[PDB]
């Protein structure tokens, strides 16, 4: 793929929803480049590099039973970026919680994330 | 105000949606701060400052009967920023439209904005 177009980013926005929902974490890391950032939440520093986006995706995913789906369409630009609206199922304490998350990414000229800043804050957060 | 807490970012955001929602262009042209840019949709050129903003905001609203509403929360960050989902309400030649948004806004320390980033393509547009 090259820098991906409106369309192409749509699908693979989608497609980084359907890997963190399954939870497989080499499928999510083989998305970004060698050398990409990670902010999340936006506001905090970024994380660098596909070991420690692995190491991240690690520590969110690795007890298996998260669930992703996006709450609305994603929002693509034709200059290889695009924002979508999702919610995450986590249980963190044996009591369900959901945080609502916007995702912002830019893709490369391969078509891989080169950037991705993930806005929510606690409030976003519901124990229920 | 200061820079926004996250809580004063999502009221915010909300009532810049407000603002569209009625259209009143002088009370959205308030919110940002002098020197302020907008990149609409992203991918595009930024405008600059608040003549700049005003007229773009005229072009889009001064009809007077478009509508906008929040579609899902604002996500906001603890350092003034936040990103949002919405859908525009537009009709476009006697036909009803309706345009899927993500706005990504960064405010300044005293809570004026700074830069705006809408991001949409035309498939998030329908005509229907």
Redesign the interface.
Known sequence: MNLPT??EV?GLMARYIELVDVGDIEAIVQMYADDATVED???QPPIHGREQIAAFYRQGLGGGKVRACL???V?????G?????FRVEMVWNGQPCAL???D?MRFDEHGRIQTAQA??????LSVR
């Open positions: 409106a369309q749509q939440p936006f506001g709450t609305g369409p929002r693509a630009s034709h200059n970026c695009g924002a979508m609206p609502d998350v916007i912002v806005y929510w804050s606690e409030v976003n």
